[PDB]
Amino acid sequence: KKNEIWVGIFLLAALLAALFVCLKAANTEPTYTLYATFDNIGGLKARSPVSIGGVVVGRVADITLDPKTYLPRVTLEIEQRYNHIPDTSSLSIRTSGLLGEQYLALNVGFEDPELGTAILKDGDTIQDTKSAMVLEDLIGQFLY
Amino acid sequence: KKNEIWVGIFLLAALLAALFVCLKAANTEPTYTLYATFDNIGGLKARSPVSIGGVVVGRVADITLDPKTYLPRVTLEIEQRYNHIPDTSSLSIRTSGLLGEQYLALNVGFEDPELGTAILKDGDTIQDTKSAMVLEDLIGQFLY
Amino acid sequence: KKNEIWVGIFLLAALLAALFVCLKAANTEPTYTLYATFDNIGGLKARSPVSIGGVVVGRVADITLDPKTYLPRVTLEIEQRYNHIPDTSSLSIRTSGLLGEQYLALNVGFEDPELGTAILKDGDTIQDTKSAMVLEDLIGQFLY
Amino acid sequence: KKNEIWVGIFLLAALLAALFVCLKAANTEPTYTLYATFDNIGGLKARSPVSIGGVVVGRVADITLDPKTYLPRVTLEIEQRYNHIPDTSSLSIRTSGLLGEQYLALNVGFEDPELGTAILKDGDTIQDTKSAMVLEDLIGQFLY
Amino acid sequence: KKNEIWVGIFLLAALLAALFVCLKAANTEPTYTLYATFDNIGGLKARSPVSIGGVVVGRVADITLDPKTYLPRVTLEIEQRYNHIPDTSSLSIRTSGLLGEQYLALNVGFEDPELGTAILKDGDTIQDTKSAMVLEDLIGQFLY
Amino acid sequence: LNALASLGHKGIKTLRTFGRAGLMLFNALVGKPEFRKHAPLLVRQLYNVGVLSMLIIVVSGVFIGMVLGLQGYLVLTTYSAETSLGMLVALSLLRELGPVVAALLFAGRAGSALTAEIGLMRATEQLSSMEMMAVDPLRRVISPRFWAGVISLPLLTVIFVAVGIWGGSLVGVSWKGIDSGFFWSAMQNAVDWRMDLVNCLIKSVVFAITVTWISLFNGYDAIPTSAGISRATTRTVVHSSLAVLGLDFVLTALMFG
Amino acid sequence: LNALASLGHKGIKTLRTFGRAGLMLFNALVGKPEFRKHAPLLVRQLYNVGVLSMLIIVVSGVFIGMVLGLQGYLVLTTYSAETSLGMLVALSLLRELGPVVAALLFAGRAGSALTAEIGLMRATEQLSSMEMMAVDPLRRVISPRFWAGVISLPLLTVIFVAVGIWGGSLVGVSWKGIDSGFFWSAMQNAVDWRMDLVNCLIKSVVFAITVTWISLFNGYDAIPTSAGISRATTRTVVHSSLAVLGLDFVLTALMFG
Ligand SMILES: CCCCCCCC/C=C/CCCCCCCC(=O)O[C@H](COC(=O)CCCCCCCCCCCCCCC)COP(=O)(O)OC[C@@H](O)CO
Ligand SMILES: CCCCCCCC/C=C/CCCCCCCC(=O)O[C@H](COC(=O)CCCCCCCCCCCCCCC)COP(=O)(O)OC[C@@H](O)CO
Ligand SMILES: CCCCCCCC/C=C/CCCCCCCC(=O)O[C@H](COC(=O)CCCCCCCCCCCCCCC)COP(=O)(O)OC[C@@H](O)CO
Ligand SMILES: CCCCCCCC/C=C/CCCCCCCC(=O)O[C@H](COC(=O)CCCCCCCCCCCCCCC)COP(=O)(O)OC[C@@H](O)CO
Ligand SMILES: CCCCCCCC/C=C/CCCCCCCC(=O)O[C@H](COC(=O)CCCCCCCCCCCCCCC)COP(=O)(O)OC[C@@H](O)CO
Ligand SMILES: CCCCCCCC/C=C/CCCCCCCC(=O)O[C@H](COC(=O)CCCCCCCCCCCCCCC)COP(=O)(O)OC[C@@H](O)CO
Ligand SMILES: CCCCCCCC/C=C\CCCCCCCC(=O)O[C@H](COC(=O)CCCCCCCCCCCCCCC)COP(=O)(O)OC[C@@H](O)CO
Ligand SMILES: CCCCCCCC/C=C\CCCCCCCC(=O)O[C@H](COC(=O)CCCCCCCCCCCCCCC)COP(=O)(O)OC[C@@H](O)CO
Ligand SMILES: CCCCCCCC/C=C\CCCCCCCC(=O)O[C@H](COC(=O)CCCCCCCCCCCCCCC)COP(=O)(O)OC[C@@H](O)CO
Ligand SMILES: CCCCCCCC/C=C\CCCCCCCC(=O)O[C@H](COC(=O)CCCCCCCCCCCCCCC)COP(=O)(O)OC[C@@H](O)CO
């Protein structure tokens, strides 16, 4: 008919308008890869956040202990927007609540002084990589 | 039947008018925006409140880690009632109990002496901004 | 006459069930009003109890942060049975266990030694008072 | 032919739903066996992980009690990829955060020095094998 | 109809035979009863287990505060497998984690010296039995 | 397109089904009070809707409270918080389980029996023979059954919560051995009269209007055959359960958000 | 006494109602396999029972998971444990809500449509005219509808749990702003394949046998009038909901006790 098509068009407009009002509400990105080697990581998993000052800048997608020396080797995915981190940076593992559930804190120890310190790029390796605390040798630190 | 359509249009409009009033009252006041920068904000998410001695006056809109220095830049929304805050006023991050959420303590550093310092308005920055505590440095430095 | 008897049993069962919920599952009197101004009240709320020695003697009515100094001005609803409170009293805010609710610990200054020291009656204010704790100044006072 | 198409869509939806639960919501390999006898295993359980540096390298079976001395006997299922563990190693039981699970922290004695120190493979025993904690002897070691 | 009754009797019997097997397997081995007395048992309820280094071997049947001296008298049920525990074996009350249940630690501290000490067979008492602990006087003696 | 015209055809006849439902409830509840003629009619319908629904409400409330008491015990005993079991059982019934599960069982038992009754009165021409005696069947048949459903679901909800709390204490105190002084006193200072008892009654009144209006209309609008009545009885259970669970989310975001 | 004789009279005719139900299921499922005649009959009944129940299962699962995500967020945010919301939502669906609520909606929608269908086939003498063609109606009518109900309720339960977990993450991650790496990884090492995934399937198979057997028998044993069919359709919803909730307590005490 005539008004039957105008009713079928006024509904499909409203049906896709709510699909654009909700999917655009409540918020892909290019990344690059870093590597780091710790002694103890315990509690860190894949998709754990990487934070600078409390703001999440990356993820963790690996860990994978490596053979022949038995140390863990974390692989990071920092976003492409934060492409100015120097190589003098550190990595530490923080606790974030209870039940484990650790994350990585990347402190941008930026110097850019003499000698010429290089910006971290795709494939490089952070060297400091402090460790995760254990809580059982801290009370052995306290009691002996 | 010329009446079953106009009743059903009014009935379906009166349901979604009730549903829009209900969903708005679950998810105003003129406010004025403040900006501040911290070294570590850990736990402060969006919509976390700002308090005057325990009474909530403000909010947090977005966190937004700043480029070219890599420090977070939190955006406040102080309400328009409390318009005599000096700019010697401090900020801190506190826990809200023992296991609570996180909040911003707007420590009002009252001076108003023979100084001639202004109050604040939209777009001015607080320079005190101590940081949030970590729970990892203090066990590392008190217990070594 | 069989249907009207069973409706009377159905209405009697719903009244015994509403008495069981309102009495065993959930458990107006003339009061009077006091005043106090604390430095920090953090966590206190309207309809929170006041207690002398542990026993509830009144509530909290409408905290309402005071202007011109921005200190919180707590005002109370103490009940007419306890009309002998000396005005050399104290107040503290305590936490009821470790993760419990937060309440006001009205300490009674049981002296009335000389001066004919007055009785808190409607509109009067308290001076001593005490401020709640924040857990960041606890570790600040411990290890600095 | 309309009914048999919709049954095929109903069977396809139940297979995509079973893949979503088994992969994103819940996430046989040849292994080998190591032996250890602790003094106290408090909280440890079958199918609990073993970890080197934080990374899971095996599980726990066989937690039964050893007669004639009444000391707990634990034997492990370490995986065939990590066939280089020196038998001068250590063992510890740790608590995974503060209220988390119990796990075995296999410390690797990375020397393989003189005398060609052997490789743990099937049936071998570990002899360092520290302890678990009880929380009573913590404060007994603190204040006596 | 001579068959609808004998089928329905067999069907109703096969349901309550299934319901009796199921309810029994949700709420054996010969054991031997043991008794002990404490000064404070706080938290130890019925059906709380007894452990050898972390492995549960016993139960608790009833508490039964004894008249004429007013001390509790807990009744144990050790399994018949572990028939070499001497009369010098200690008992203690422990927490099972940090916030756990409560349990009895059957410390098998056997000397078996040059003189022939006996075995805890049925109906004999343990005299070691330290007590449970309370964190009220312990804080009251360490802080005074 | 021949698909857009068929979709707008179903979108028009959905609008005048909502309009027929608004005219049925308006012409049933409005005009000439008649408190003496309708008072015996209310008591008979309060038997069919309310008294005959007490078996599915009392037996289901005891089992649901016993499952809540058993499943909440195993969670709380990890953190040594098992004296808070009565607070957990009572609050999870006064919100979200007392209102919702008693409305889903009301829609299946009393909502199906109301659609089947009215559609049978049109298949045997009882509603047309009342119009011939100059009696309005919307005021005489529909409206005593509406008020019987709005009265009896708030009364069946408070019985559901009462025997559900008793079944939870039957597991916690009697079987597991929690101290009964700690069990009941932790419940009494957690349950507020405004946030918990009044909000339970607001939910069960909104649910009672919705379930009864859907159930009365689907019998009044049914096709008066033996197969068309059974199709409308199934349509009541689907439309009532999607409306109870949908409104339960909107009222949860309002009351406790 | 004249009361003890009337109680023993109802206790005898309850025994031979259980005996008629055991003879109906035994003579439907036993003898002469017939895999080729019954394979087109299974696919048509798998449409009526399974495909036509997907609307009430998908829409109810999203709303129930969203209420669980909103109500569990307000509890966990007191103790700063809100990254454990995904463990709470997934475990409270794999036990006690996935099996139970999908069985109560299966009993109201597909259980009512099965009692109404079979009782209509006896009111129009379709089952008696099949015996006159020397076709057994217990093997040809009853048994394809039994296996369609035992197949489709385990398949509808796994769809209910899947869209319920998605609705819980839709509140926790998208609206409240929990870190999505913490949300999903805390769920994955809490959900075990044996204690959680297999125990969800055992419950939904025990519920599928019980609901389908009750629903097929109440249509086969109904009084073949238009009022006797509607009485048997209501009897299915009451007997299925009391049996699902009763068996849910016994299986909870076994599996997780
Ligand atoms: C110095 C050393 C320090 C050591 C310290 C170490 C230890 C420290 C902590 C230990 C653990 C603490 C234990 C916590 C125990 C307390 C847990 C508890 O009681 O939870 C209650 C559950 O009620 C609730 O809302 C949950 C109630 C609703 C539950 C949701 C319904 C479930 C089903 C969903 C519906 C589906 C649709 C219907 C199905 C068809 C919340 O009540 P609440 O108190 O908050 O008051 C109400 C108001 O404040 C809102 O919260
Ligand atoms: C379509 C056919 C219509 C048929 C109508 C059928 C019958 C309609 C209702 C019957 C009784 C309702 C029982 C509800 C009892 C609850 C009534 C109640 O006291 O709740 C008040 C709020 O209510 C509220 O938000 C408003 C909530 C109540 C609404 C619940 C029913 C919704 C539909 C009602 C529509 C008719 C209303 C006509 C009003 C013009 C709270 O204040 P309260 O003092 O405690 O302390 C306030 C303190 O917090 C500060 O002062
Ligand atoms: C004081 C507070 C007052 C608040 C007032 C708020 C007003 C709330 C209105 C409720 C209307 C209820 C009317 C009943 C509508 C029930 C919905 C319905 O009809 O069901 C299906 C559609 O479902 C559907 O698309 C999905 C239907 C939605 C179900 C209705 C939800 C109620 C509102 C919840 C929205 C939450 C939004 C949350 C946003 C975050 C029909 O398909 P179907 O052909 O198979 O039929 C079967 C047969 O035809 C088989 O051939
Ligand atoms: C030094 C200073 C020290 C300071 C330290 C201070 C702080 C210390 C503590 C802080 C608080 C801790 C927060 C606790 C957060 C964790 C809470 C949580 O996740 O609970 C889970 C809920 O799953 C559950 O079973 C609950 C699941 C089922 C829920 C019941 C269903 C609800 C409805 C009922 C059905 C009605 C019938 C159907 C309706 C018609 C249990 O999973 P769980 O991990 O146990 O693993 C499974 C297995 O071990 C069994 O437990
Ligand atoms: C009345 C008409 C009858 C019609 C019959 C209809 C169809 C009947 C079933 C169909 C498929 C069932 C799917 C269930 C899949 C679950 C099967 C399953 O693997 O579960 C096993 C236990 O099961 C168990 O307790 C027993 C539980 C399964 C029973 C669930 C259905 C109950 C009724 C079944 C009656 C027929 C059974 C005939 C058997 C003789 C666990 O071991 P699993 O290797 O994982 O690791 C063991 C590890 O812990 C140590 O080795
Ligand atoms: C692998 C595991 C296998 C386990 C196997 C276990 C076997 C489990 C048997 C289930 C039988 C289900 C058969 C269906 C029985 C359903 C019960 C029933 O018929 O309902 C009413 C009786 O309710 C009643 O007294 C109460 C009926 C009880 C409901 C059935 C419970 C099922 C078993 C749960 C017991 C938990 C015990 C827990 C103990 C701690 C009848 O009244 P009513 O005239 O109005 O009729 C309406 C009409 O006649 C109106 O005129
Ligand atoms: C189907 C059953 C039909 C029931 C029929 C309807 C039931 C009733 C409806 C609405 C409630 C009426 C409104 C209440 C009237 C008063 C409303 C009001 O705001 O006044 C409050 C008094 O509270 C009051 O004493 C009134 C409180 C007394 C308790 C009465 C509450 C009604 C209980 C509801 C029944 C539960 C049954 C359903 C259970 C599932 C003052 O503030 P409140 O003192 O806090 O602070 C001050 C303090 O801190 C000291 O200064
Ligand atoms: C409607 C859908 C129809 C589904 C059709 C039926 C689904 C399947 C039924 C029963 C399961 C089959 C029995 C499992 C066979 C194996 C049974 C078994 O006991 O073997 C275990 C292996 O586990 C294994 O790899 C087998 C584990 C692999 C995972 C397969 C589990 C089946 C998942 C269930 C589907 C979920 C869908 C429903 C979701 C609601 C060994 O012990 P486990 O290694 O632990 O310790 C050792 C470790 O610590 C290292 O030494
Ligand atoms: C106390 C305060 C609370 C009160 C709560 C009030 C809530 C209760 C009000 C009315 C219910 C009374 C019954 C109303 C009618 C029952 C619902 C209905 O409309 O029926 C069918 C559903 O259509 C359907 O696809 C379901 C269609 C969608 C249902 C509407 C969803 C709810 C409203 C969201 C707006 C969406 C607009 C678009 C979103 C922007 C339409 O039949 P259809 O044509 O197939 O003909 C074929 C054959 O089935 C009958 O002719
Ligand atoms: C865990 C459980 C917790 C305890 C639960 C206790 C049990 C539940 C308590 C109260 C609910 C009872 C509601 C009272 C209903 C009374 C209303 C009534 O009389 O209804 C008539 C019969 O109803 C009826 O089905 C008679 C109702 C019978 C009630 C069910 C009792 C079953 C007891 C044996 C079961 C053995 C199981 C194992 C038990 C150890 C229906 O006829 P109608 O009006 O149309 O015309 C008149 C003419 O036909 C009646 O002769």
Ligand SMILES: CCCCCCCC/C=C\CCCCCCCC(=O)O[C@H](COC(=O)CCCCCCCCCCCCCCC)COP(=O)(O)OC[C@@H](O)CO
């Ligand atoms: C996979 C493994 C799991 C499988 C699970 C199996 C469970 C499913 C099995 C069979 C259900 C099939 C349908 C069976 C029949 C449906 C239940 C039934 O018996 O029907 C009525 C209930 O009677 C009633 O009072 C309900 C009566 C009590 C129901 C029995 C409770 C459950 C068994 C507890 C024993 C109690 C003994 C005493 C306790 C010591 C009796 O009609 P009545 O005479 O009124 O005539 C008048 C008119 O209603 C029909 O003639």
Ligand SMILES: CCCCCCCC/C=C\CCCCCCCC(=O)O[C@H](COC(=O)CCCCCCCCCCCCCCC)COP(=O)(O)OC[C@@H](O)CO
């Ligand atoms: C929050 C929700 C989350 C998302 C939920 C998405 C919605 C749900 C998704 C999938 C379930 C759909 C199941 C697919 C069913 C398909 C099976 C089917 O075709 O059934 C026929 C119609 O069914 C039907 O009611 C047609 C089913 C319609 C499905 C409902 C769509 C409603 C959309 C507009 C609502 C506006 C509300 C506001 C939205 C913004 C029944 O005829 P029957 O076979 O006997 O003979 C043939 C001849 O009669 C059919 O022409």
